[PDB]
Design a protein around this nucleic acid. Structure first.
Lengths: 91, 247, 62, 67, 206, 27, 128, 134, 38, 41, 19, 205
RNA sequence: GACGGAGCCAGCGAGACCUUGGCCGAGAGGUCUUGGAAACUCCGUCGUGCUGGGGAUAGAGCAUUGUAAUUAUUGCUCUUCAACGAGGAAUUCCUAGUAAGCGCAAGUCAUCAGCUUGCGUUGAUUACGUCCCUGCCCUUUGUACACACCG
């Protein structure tokens, strides 16, 4: 309700929506600083499109399509240890 | 896609907890699951049974299909529950009904509300099929009128809501078919009657089937999720179980 | 001798008995000439059918 | 006029062509009495237009001069 | 003019039978029967009896009941093998039907030197009833091509089954016999007879 | 009222247990 | 290191892991030759890739397949579909792109289940 | 480079069964003609002359397929369905067959229990494996 | 001896007349607990 | 706008006496009478 | 452990993944 | 919203019960049925043009519906989504049938042949795959990843060649003759391909 | 299809007793120690004979479990060798991993003890069109935002 918008809205809430913060909660990156480098280097995709800007806030409907680019060298490492690396998918 | 269901369950359990706190504070409307679609979108129901069902459960499933106007019968041949719930979630189904039997005698009935619960299980007693009736004839499949009698407790209003939305809303005032759910010491007596308004009263005729239920398990989740948090259970071994009433 | 005719239209609202459909078929020998026939199995467009008799005109079969 | 219009078209598709020839003859008779045509001219126009559309490939076939 | 795509001899360290090499040259049913010379004699059955796609074995795991007319694309040999398995006790046992049809095709090639697949296609073409009756009494009505092939397969299979149900004849040899007799058009085959009285009864009610 | 309640068209034998119970209350 | 590629093939619960590397033409499944697979009637089924694309491609590489789970037919489908994926992936990683295009065209033209998983997910055909 | 796994399954046992029968040093108990090989069975082995030697060839490979094997495994391995019970194969025959093999040197007692492929037997199995191929 | 749980009821006639009476009174008053459009 | 640029992958531009000419016209030749159906009239 | 085992994201990465 | 270009008026408006967020649309050749698609709801809403009422909602995707199109002649619906699948809906008729076809990667754009016999779809991998609607089987595949031209942004910290930002086509459309597709995306290239041979005709900056 | 060999592929499941392995016995089953699946495939025998299908009843033995009785209980060996040869009038259900065949596991508060539930394995025929018959409903103030159609 509107009377809640005046107090519920806080800077921490928008920071939580920030992409590196979301990656940390999704546990893709161990630390917020780490997530920024991965975004800068281009290993992350939010739906169909790659995002290079750490300051991007992911909206609620995009937050589960945030994932890694198919040909990320690190996404290969994900499958190499678990031994689920299927190379038909090129990943 | 797994991350959609993983997140929303946390939202769903959070919503129920907040609703529970609000009700408790009020103690000191329609349920959240049904508040979204109550009186807007007509329910979509799938009726199924256990695997390799006996003939009676197939007919009894056909009966439970006929009771609800928007119900459709589905064979359970070799299906797996995660596949069933995902597949029924896939088709837009609102509720799923599973039936169990013992030597072709229906014993249990379970209702799971989509997309995210709750799941209510029932135990079927004194079941009398209409197939046990000679020359019964065909039914009326109009949107039936609906009666709930002797439901007082908060758990009763919940059981009311779960059974409430299985039917279509807005029957015609002269709709000829009536369904009654009557609790008598947790003993929900269910009858299907058809009437005629006379010049000096009313006369009703049973269509059947006759069959009694006891609720014994309500959980916050789909019937597949055996790890779902439990709202309520029938706890039978208490010394007051022989004389306690809930509904 | 038996003639061959390709279905050119599957008629609708013909009220034929269940399992029977009224169709229109053009003879392969003469594309112009066409005859209405009653067929029992499933039917679709562009399939060809064997007519032993090419004179009888189909009548709606209750 | 009695035939339902939503059901006119299928009645015309079921029409045998040997009957269509008769229908053209009936339509022929309509124009001699100018009054009968004018009373319900639109319906006569539609029915004639569907019959020919239904059986245009047939109609190009009959080389009969009287037709 | 000559075309070569292979310039080094291909020796696979894992041995292969040479017959599989000739199979590399061409796809044949059980690596023994060719589909190139198989053509449907009757024009009506064309587009509904499918032989153009060669297969080593009948088993395909294809999906042919999704749409009303997927079955037309299914190979005819698969359809015969799949119709062979019935009666409950044989339900679920498709690979046995594969063995049975293999033995049947062998018997066909033995008794008649003609390509056995040609015998099968000719038999199904011959045994398809072109007209039948429908209960109003009866009224005569013609038959759709997919219904023709379905009835042909069903009649052939049930005749082969009943002939050897309690007889010294095995299902392979009786199936071969009824296929040959149907291809010849002789009245000896069960399916040809049944097609005959169906057409005759329709003529009586024509 | 009695005609059109087949549970008490006619039902199969044994669908009802009234005769068993009435004997018991008398006891 | 030796150029190598890994892939999987799944049919029902049957799963096969196919490793394709540079070699002198040894194809093995569960450590045994491909010729010894059982049922023999469906042996040609697992041969459908080898027979369709040509053996000199295989004469220039090693394949080893390990199968677990499911039944005989499902295991055969896993073997074929995995080895097809392994061949195309090898030709992508260590051979030109035209080759993988030709192999994909041939495989999808003959049988797409060789390259895509065939999963009959439940579908309520009736609406409602 | 020939190995037992490289040869077709039924061929190796039949060839190695004939290898054992012609060889003439495989001990065969007196009661072979008077046993079932399992209680669930209803008739004895029809090839009374050679089934034990075929039995020896069959087990002599299972030790090659599975590095360590014991009598209990052979009993379940050769067991079959009979409500069904799935009774295991006869324990006596399986033990006599195993004991028979190391008399030839094909097999020998493994550490931590069970039998081991006697390294001499490993060439012996490979020898007939090459025999079938050639 | 004591019984742990509630006995399952018996639908004797007198129960049957009582139930159908309540059904008739509900419809006589049109006191129907059924869902409506919102 | 402020939140959109935070939440937009692709560029979001900033949203923007005497008689007046209208930039946009919602055709000029078309007449208001001609835009009314017979049943409306 | 079960509900947790159910709610796996397959995309979970950790620097120890390499070894 | 429904617009007439003869009188230039909005004669009808359609909206969901919960105001579902629409991204794609399709109109029936007969002009009596409308389907719209959403990124948040996973179901295709259907409306009647004459009445403006919601006929029903076509469920069947785990993923957000990316695009919709009706056959001009046969009147089937092809719906494509990030669920790695494509479904053919035969809504018209007494009985409804749905034919799902699986795809390697998420589909972004779908173009449907004017004949209505084939459908082409663009995926994230940069593949234009054509499937036979009647047979529900793939008939051709085109590779587009290499032909696409993408420029390194000034803000980028990794090279264009190593980048993966946009080597897919977010939009595709057939030629009316039916032998070519024009494809475009979040990139600096339009690629014109040929269907029967699966080759790039020309590329435009 | 029965029988004899050989070949082998699953997924559910964890509140002393289980066990890998050795030695005995034809089997059932004993004894000494260590740790805590079928269906199905290949090759063979048998053959239209109530036959090598069917295993009810009955006799003789070899063992297990308690318990204190010569008590039953659960298995194994041989012999004996029945009804049943596809099922009337009628009747019930069923459209894809579906009908059907196949085995495995747990008894997790209602219900179930060779019964209930769960798991996986092989795997179809035919239809996917119609309101003609039957049955159940809706409409007969467009009300409906343009065009078209209807009145």
């Amino acid at each position: 309700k509107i009377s809640d918008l005046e107090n519920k809205v806080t800077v921490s809430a928008i920071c939580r929506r920030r992409l590196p913060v979301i990656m940390h909660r999704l546990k893709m990156a161990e630390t917020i600083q780490d997530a920024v480098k991965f975004i800068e280097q281009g290993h992350v995709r939010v739906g169909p499109n790659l995002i290079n800007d750490p300051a991007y806030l992911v909206t609620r409907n995009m937050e589960d399509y945030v994932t890694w680019v198919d040909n990320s060298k690190i996404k290969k490492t994900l499958l190499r240890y678990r031994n689920q690396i299927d190379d038909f998918d090129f990943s | 896609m797994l991350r959609r269901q993983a997140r929303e369950r946390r939202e769903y359990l959070y919503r129920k907890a907040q609703e529970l706190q609000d009700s408790q504070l009020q103690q000191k409307q329609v349920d959240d699951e049904y508040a979204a679609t109550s009186g807007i979108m007509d329910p979509r129901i799938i009726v199924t049974t256990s695997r390799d069902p006996s003939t009676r459960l197939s007919q009894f499933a056909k009966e439970i299909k006929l009771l609800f106007p928007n119900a459709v019968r589905l064979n359970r041949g070799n299906y797996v529950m995660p596949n069933l719930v995902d597949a029924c979630k896939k088709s837009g189904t609102t509720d799923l009904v599973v039936l169990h039997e013992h030597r072709g005698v229906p014993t249990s009935l379970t209702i799971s509300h989509f997309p995210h619960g709750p799941t209510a299980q029932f135990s079927l007693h004194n079941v009398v099929m209409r197939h046990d009736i000679i020359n019964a004839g065909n039914q009326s499949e109009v949107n039936p009128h609906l009666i709930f009698d002797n439901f007082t407790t908060a758990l009763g209003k919940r059981v009311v809501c779960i059974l409430k939305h299985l039917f279509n809303a807005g029957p015609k005032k002269d709709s000829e078919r009536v369904i009654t759910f009557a609790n008598r010491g947790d003993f929900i007596s269910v009858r299907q009657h058809v009437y005629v308004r006379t010049r000096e009263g009313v006369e009703i005729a049973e269509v059947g089937p006759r069959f009694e239920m006891r609720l014994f398990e309500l959980r916050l989740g789909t019937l597949e999720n055996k790890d779902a948090d439990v709202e309520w259970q029938l706890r039978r071994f208490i010394r007051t179980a022989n004389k306690k009433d809930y509904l | 001798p038996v003639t061959l005719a390709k279905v050119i239209k599957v008629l609708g609202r013909t009220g034929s008995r269940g399992g029977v459909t009224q169709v229109r078929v053009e003879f392969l020998e003469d594309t112009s000439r066409t005859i209405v026939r009653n067929v029992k199995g499933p039917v679709r467009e562009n399939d060809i059918l064997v007519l032993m008799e090419s004179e009888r005109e189909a009548r709606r079969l209750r | 006029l009695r035939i339902r219009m939503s059901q006119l078209e299928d009645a015309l598709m079921v029409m045998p062509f040997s009957y269509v020839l008769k229908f053209l003859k009936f339509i022929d008779t309509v124009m001699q009495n100018k009054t009968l045509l004018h009373s319900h001219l639109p319906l006569i126009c539609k029915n004639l237009f569907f019959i020919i559309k239904f059986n245009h490939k047939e109609l190009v076939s009959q080389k009969n001069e009287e037709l | 003019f000559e075309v070569v795509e292979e310039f080094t001899p291909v020796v696979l360290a894992t041995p292969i039978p040479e017959e599989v090499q000739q199979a590399q040259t061409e796809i044949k049913l059980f690596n023994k029967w060719s589909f190139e010379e198989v053509e449907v004699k009757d024009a009506s059955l064309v587009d509904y009896v499918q032989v153009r796609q060669p297969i080593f074995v009948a088993h395909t795991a294809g999906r042919y009941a999704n749409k009303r007319f997927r079955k037309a694309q299914c190979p005819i040999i698969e359809r015969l093998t799949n119709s062979l398995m019935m009666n409950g006790r044989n339900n679920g046992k498709k690979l046995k039907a594969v063995r049975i049809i293999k033995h049947t095709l062998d018997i066909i090639n033995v008794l008649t030197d003609q390509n056995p697949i040609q015998v099968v296609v000719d038999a199904i073409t011959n045994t398809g009833p072109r007209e039948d009756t429908t209960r109003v009494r009866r009224q005569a009505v013609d038959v759709s091509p997919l219904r023709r092939v379905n009835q042909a397969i069903a009649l052939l299979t049930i005749g082969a089954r009943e002939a050897a149900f309690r007889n010294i004849k095995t299902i392979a040899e009786t199936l071969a016999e009824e296929l040959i007799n149907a291809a010849k058009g002789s009245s000896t085959s069960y399916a040809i007879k049944k097609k005959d009285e169906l057409e005759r009864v329709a003529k009586s009610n024509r | 009222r009695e005609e059109f309640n087949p549970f008490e068209a006619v039902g199969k034998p044994g669908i009802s247990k009234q005769i068993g119970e009435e004997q018991r209350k008398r006891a | 290191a030796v150029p190598s590629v890994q892939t999987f093939g799944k049919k029902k619960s049957a799963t096969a892991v196919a490793h394709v590397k540079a070699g002198k033409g040894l194809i093995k499944v569960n450590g045994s030759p491909i010729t010894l697979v059982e049922p023999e009637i469906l042996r040609f089924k697992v041969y459908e890739p080898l027979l369709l694309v040509g053996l000199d491609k295989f004469s220039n590489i090693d394949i080893r397949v390990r199968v677990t789970g499911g039944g005989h037919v499902s295991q055969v489908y896993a073997i074929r579909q995995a080895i097809a994926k392994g061949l195309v992936a090898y030709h992508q990683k260590y051979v030109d792109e035209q080759s993988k295009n030709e192999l994909k065209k041939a495989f999808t033209s003959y049988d797409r289940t060789l390259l895509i998983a065939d999963s009959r997910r439940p579908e309520p055909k009736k609406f409602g | 480079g020939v190995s037992v796994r490289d040869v077709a399954a039924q061929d190796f046992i039949n060839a190695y069964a004939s290898f054992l029968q012609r060889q003439g040093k495989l001990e065969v108990p007196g009661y072979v003609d008077i046993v079932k090989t399992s209680s669930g069975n209803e008739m004895p082995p029809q090839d009374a002359e050679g089934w034990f030697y075929k039995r020896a060839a069959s087990v002599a490979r299972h030790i090659y397929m599975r590095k360590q094997v014991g009598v209990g495994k052979l009993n379940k391995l050769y067991g079959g369905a009979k409500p069904y019970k799935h009774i295991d194969a006869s324990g006596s025959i399986n033990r006599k067959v195993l004991q028979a093999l190391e008399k030839i040197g094909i097999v020998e007692i493994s550490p931590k229990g069970g039998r081991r492929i006697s390294e001499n037997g490993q060439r012996d199995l490979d020898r007939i494996a090459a025999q079938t191929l050639e | 001896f004591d019984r742990t749980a509630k006995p399952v009821p018996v639908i004797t006639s007198e129960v049957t007349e009582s139930l159908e009476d309540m059904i008739r009174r509900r419809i006589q008053d049109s006191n129907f607990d059924d869902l409506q459009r919102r | 706008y402020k939140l959109d640029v935070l939440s937009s992958v692709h560029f979001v531009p900033k949203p923007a006496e005497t008689p007046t000419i209208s930039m946009e016209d919602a055709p000029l030749y078309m007449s208001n009478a001609s835009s009314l159906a017979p049943q409306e009239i | 452990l079960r509900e947790k085992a159910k709610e796996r994201n397959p995309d979970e990465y950790y620097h120890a993944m390499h070894s | 919203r429904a617009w007439d270009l003869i009188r230039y008026r909005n004669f009808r408006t359609f909206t969901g019960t919960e105001r579902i967020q629409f991204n794609c649309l399709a109109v029936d050749p007969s002009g009596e049925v409308v389907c719209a698609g959403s990124l948040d709801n996973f179901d295709i809403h259907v409306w009647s043009v004459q009445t403006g009422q919601l006929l029903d909602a076509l469920s069947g995707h785990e993923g957000p519906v990316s695009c919709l199109s009706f056959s001009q002649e046969n009147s089937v619906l092809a719906s494509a989504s990030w669920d790695k699948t494509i479904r053919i809906w035969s809504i018209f008729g007494r009985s409804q049938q749905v034919e799902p076809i699986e795809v390697y990667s998420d589909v972004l754009a779908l173009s449907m042949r004017p004949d209505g016999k084939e459908v082409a779809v663009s995926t994230l991998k940069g593949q234009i795959s054509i499937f036979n609607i009647e047979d529900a089987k793939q008939v051709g595949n085109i590779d587009c990843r290499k032909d696409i031209i993408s420029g390194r942004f000034n803000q980028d910290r990794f090279t264009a060649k190593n980048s993966e930002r946009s080597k897919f086509f977010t939009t595709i459309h057939y030629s009316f003759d039916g032998m070519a597709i024009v494809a475009g995306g979040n990139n600096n290239s339009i690629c014109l391909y040929d269907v029967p041979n699966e080759v790039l005709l020309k590329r435009f900056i």
